[PDB]
Symmetry: C4
Subunit: 95 residues, 4 copies
Amino acid sequence: KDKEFQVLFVLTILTLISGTIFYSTVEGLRPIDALYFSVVTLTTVGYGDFSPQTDFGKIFTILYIFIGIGLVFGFIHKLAVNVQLPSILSNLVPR
Amino acid sequence: KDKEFQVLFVLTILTLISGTIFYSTVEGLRPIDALYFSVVTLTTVGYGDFSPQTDFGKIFTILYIFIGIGLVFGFIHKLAVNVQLPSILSNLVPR
Amino acid sequence: KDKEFQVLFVLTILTLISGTIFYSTVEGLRPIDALYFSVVTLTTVGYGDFSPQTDFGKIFTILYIFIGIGLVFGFIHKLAVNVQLPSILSNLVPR
Amino acid sequence: KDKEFQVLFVLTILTLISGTIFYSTVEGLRPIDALYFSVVTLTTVGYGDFSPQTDFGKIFTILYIFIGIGLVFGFIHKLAVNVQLPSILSNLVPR
Ligand SMILES: [K+]
Ligand SMILES: [K+]
Ligand SMILES: [K+]
Ligand SMILES: [K+]
Ligand SMILES: [K+]
Ligand SMILES: [K+]
């Protein structure tokens, strides 16, 4: 299950890297703003402080959302159940 | 399962076409902006760079969200489990 | 299952009515804008074209989200599986 | 199950407290606006009336979303099934 989580973890990083590179280059965002934008899109928070202005950027975002949500959400759930939950349970039993 | 995914795939396309046509016509968006708006609403990202200004558009959006989320989300999950997952597993075994 | 869906359906209506009344009165929105705002909050689209300006409105929105998401999402899923799905299947068999 | 819900309930409070403190201090929001922002981020509504302006705040928000969504969503579901549902069923049987 550490190997389940590692694969998902890695795939998320690669996914957020892909959005960082595209949005920084095509839409002109600072690298840190691209990442933060990529994270805020794929978790569907969507503040809208950043949003794509070019048509290429709009098209890309369509496909990035559809390809990216299922992964991101899969990692978060794996993180909650296989990492966050056990550490919670462990804190309720003094060793 | 390719036939499960095809039906959902098709139904999503038709759903996004429906929003493209309405928002372009009633709210005046360029076709590409309507589509991008439709995609950003039904995945609940909701940047808000576009949002309906007319009462008809507001009413329509209410019903489009309720009818449209269950489908969109169903396709994304089908896409993740029946397409994205297998291709991931296949990349871990040289043929 | 029509009785499952009816109860949820009703509970959603009552929930959106509650938000319509509060936001129209406390935040001053037109009734139609309150409803549209209530729908856009509880489905977590969150365009932000409307958002509460008063502290009372901010507090209320906190609790409305937590009480309201589980219901709304429950209705949408019931709608997708017990209404939308069957009608889809029925359209693939000429009577 | 009251003990399931209590643990989750508590963990959510602590999570929203953590965001209240950071956003009030680092981003300068009034305590009430930080809380409301924290709640609106972790439920992925994301109105965007508030959004982090500093790079530290942007980085923090990335990790807060990933750590925080799984919890928040877990509480809401526990709330819907173990508290909201039973009280609904109880209202359909006069004692
Ligand atoms: K959302
Ligand atoms: K959102
Ligand atoms: K949003
Ligand atoms: K927004
Ligand atoms: K979900
Ligand atoms: K969601």
